[PDB]
Fold this protein.
Amino acid sequence: GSHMLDFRVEYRDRNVDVVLEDTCTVGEIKQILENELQIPVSKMLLKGWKTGDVEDSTVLKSLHLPKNNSLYVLT
């Protein structure tokens, strides 16, 4: 929708900026990172959420996040 969330995602000291609607799911961040970083989603751990129980199917809106967010990838 209209409401947009920014994620600065760290990997190997570089930053990937992912911006997407809060109606999207966490897994869509990973799908975008798969294309940006050329790493299959199965091979990445996306970490840095400030709360527990976050899953790929979590809808971002349900986390009531601020505009700018930070995450990181482990492979």
